[PDB]
């Protein structure tokens, strides 16, 4: 149908916007602490602590499959990256501190992203 095509165009445009958002968020992690999944070889007990692991590479996979239907779903995954890190790691670690900085700097980006999604009407 023409409607389904229109819906798919909207999703494709959302995916384009979120790809820009993802790139901006990841630029706020130049240490690449959050770039890849935590290794279960190097941290074998990780899943005892963290029930829903997340990282930028896993987000990018979902994004390119157009698996984010709205900005809320994308934000949920970003918050998982931050929140998982701040539970597993103590306050005095480079990991926890990187997550705080990413959260703070990311908030700016996500604030305007919400406005753009609402304005352009992409969801
Ligand atoms: Na903790």
From Swiss-Prot:
There is a cross-link at residue 41 (Glycyl lysine isopeptide (Lys-Gly) (interchain with G-Cter in SUMO2)). Highly expressed in testis. Residues 9-113 form the Bromo domain. It is found in: Nucleus; Chromosome. Component of some HBO1 complex composed of KAT7/HBO1, MEAF6, ING4 and BRD1/BRPF2. Component of the MOZ/MORF complex composed at least of ING5, KAT6A, KAT6B, MEAF6 and one of BRPF1, BRD1/BRPF2 and BRPF3. Interacts (via PHD-type zinc finger domain) with unmodified histone H3. Interacts (via PWWP domain) with dimethylated and trimethylated 'Lys-79' on histone H3. Scaffold subunit of various histone acetyltransferase (HAT) complexes, such as the MOZ/MORF and HBO1 complexes, that acts as a regulator of hematopoiesis. Plays a key role in HBO1 complex by directing KAT7/HBO1 specificity towards histone H3 'Lys-14' acetylation (H3K14ac), thereby promoting erythroid differentiation. This is Bromodomain-containing protein 1. It comes from Homo sapiens (Human).
């Amino acid at each position: 149908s023409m409607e389904q095509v229109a819906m798919e165009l909207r999703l494709t445009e959302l995916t384009r916007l979120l790809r820009s958002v993802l790139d901006q968020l990841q630029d706020k992690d130049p240490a690449r602490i959050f770039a890849q999944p935590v290794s279960l070889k190097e941290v074998p007990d990780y899943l005892d602590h963290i029930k829903h692991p997340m990282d930028f590479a896993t987000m990018r996979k979902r994004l390119e499959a157009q698996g984010y239907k709205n900005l809320h779903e994308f934000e949920e995954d970003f918050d998982l990256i931050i929140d998982n890190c701040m539970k597993y790691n103590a306050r005095d670690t480079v990991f926890y501190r990187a997550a705080v900085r990413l959260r703070d700097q990311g908030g700016v980006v996500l604030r305007q992203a919400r406005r753009e999604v609402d304005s352009i009407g992409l969801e």
